[PDB]
Design a protein around this nucleic acid. Structure first.
Length: 49
DNA sequence: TTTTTTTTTTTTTTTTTTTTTTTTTTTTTTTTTTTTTTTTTTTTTTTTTTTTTTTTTTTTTTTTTTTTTTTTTTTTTTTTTTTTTTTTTTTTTTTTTTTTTTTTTTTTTTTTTTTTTT
């Protein structure tokens, strides 16, 4: 669920009793978009080229 | 300090219902085949004076079988009633006009990541 109320940004992800929790967070980083790779490419017009 | 009662969401998987992929039948649609209309010219058909020997109508009289005729009893005709179809008032619904309130989609271009197939 979400619990954002203009005092931050809260997304609660409840963990089951039979689960480590840290392993779930590592899986979420690996699979989900919580970790994203920003591909830097510094191209700009210098002297109009 | 140990032990006892109750509460719910999950191990759930199966029954019921819903949703989503399917393909028989009457209504469209493109094709070929047969009805219509306008020109050329063409031997061919067809319109109109003259003569002619014909063959059917009008003097007159005759009869007979269709035109006179009266009457019995049928039976088509007309009357009432009711059903079926046609046709027109009535109602309903939908569309367009011009200023208002709201929205919703398809593609380029590069680079990086997921997400399936081999």
């Amino acid at each position: 669920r979400d619990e954002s109320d203009k005092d931050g940004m809260r997304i609660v992800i409840e963990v089951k009793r039979d689960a480590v929790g840290e392993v779930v967070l590592n899986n979420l980083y690996s699979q989900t978009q919580l970790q994203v790779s920003f591909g830097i490419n510094m191209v700009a017009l210098h002297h109009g080229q």
